Amino acid sequence: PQITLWKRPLVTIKIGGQLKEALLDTGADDTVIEEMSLPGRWKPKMIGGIGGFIKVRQYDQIIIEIAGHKAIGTVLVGPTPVNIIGRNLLTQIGATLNF
Amino acid sequence: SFNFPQITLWKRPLVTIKIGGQLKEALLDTGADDTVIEEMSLPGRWKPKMIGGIGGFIKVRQYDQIIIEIAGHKAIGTVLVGPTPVNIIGRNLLTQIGATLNF
Numbered sequence: 001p002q003i004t005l006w007k008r009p010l011v012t013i014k015i016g017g018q019l020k021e022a023l024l025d026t027g028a029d030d031t032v033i034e035e036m037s038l039p040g041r042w043k044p045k046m047i048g049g050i051g052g053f054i055k056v057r058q059y060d061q062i063i064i065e066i067a068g069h070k071a072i073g074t075v076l077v078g079p080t081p082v083n084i085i086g087r088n089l090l091t092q093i094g095a096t097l098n099f
Numbered sequence: 100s101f102n103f104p105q106i107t108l109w110k111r112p113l114v115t116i117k118i119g120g121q122l123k124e125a126l127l128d129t130g131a132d133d134t135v136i137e138e139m140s141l142p143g144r145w146k147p148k149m150i151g152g153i154g155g156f157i158k159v160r161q162y163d164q165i166i167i168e169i170a171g172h173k174a175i176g177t178v179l180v181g182p183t184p185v186n187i188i189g190r191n192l193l194t195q196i197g198a199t200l201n202f
């Protein structure tokens with residue numbers, strides 16, 4: 001619960017019965033995780049980053065545990081190089097950025 | 100506090116920065132290794148670099164030892180200049196203003 005930024009802020013997540021590592025990312029609007037199957041229905045979405053846009057699958061109301069905190073919300077699945085926890089779920093677990 | 104704000108993440112964590120004499124808005128971004136600013140003029144030597152993120156890579160100019168004011172806090176470090184859609188303050192400078200994640 002107090003994470004400095006001299007290293008990447010990586011945490012463990014539990015999603016679709018798997019443990020994975022993910023990046024706590026205040027610069028991401030959305031949560032984007034590498035290809036895997038999830039227990040739900042999806043719809044298409046386009047999202048942008050540095051370097052253009054990618055197609056992802058949008059899964060709503062997904063149960064995901066981040067550093068032991070449970071969230072239930074939208075997870076995007078697509079060709080990201082790193083699993084990213086964005087503000088939609090950072091807010092659910094009560095994360096803040098402090099000076 | 101006003102001098103050391105606790106920033107909630109309901110909205111994008113945007114702040115005012117001053118760089119190269121100019122005021123700009125930038126994103127405080129714990130998920131970025133580097134600080135990347137839109138095309139602008141900076142002094143000194145630079146070297147070309149490729150940096151990547153979600154969509155792929157962009158070519159930037161790397162400048163070292165740049166002074167930047169971030170929400171009124173002084174930080175010095177490398178700044179990459181290039182075709183980023185959003186100015187972002189990455190971990191190399193967030194550490195210099197004592198930023199932490201808390202939950």
Ligand SMILES: CC(C)(C)NC(=O)[C@@H]1C[C@@H]2CCCC[C@@H]2CN1C[C@@H](O)[C@H](Cc1ccccc1)NC(=O)[C@H](CC(N)=O)NC(=O)c1ccc2ccccc2n1
Nearest residue numbers: 027028030048049050081130131132133150151152153185
């Ligand atoms: C994740 C998504 C919802 C698409 N949002 C974003 O990606 C938004 C888009 C915004 C507008 C365009 C400019 C970027 C800002 C902030 N970003 C969030 C932002 O936090 C984003 C998230 C991220 C992390 C790691 C890998 C990829 C993507 N970081 C980045 O784009 C930074 C840029 C940099 N410093 O070089 N990338 C990295 O720090 C980084 C780290 C490891 C990597 C490994 C392999 C390939 C690329 C890698 N890039």
Ligand SMILES: [Cl-]
Nearest residue numbers: 073074088089
């Ligand atoms: Cl959500």
Ligand SMILES: [Cl-]
Nearest residue numbers: 175176177191
């Ligand atoms: Cl630096």
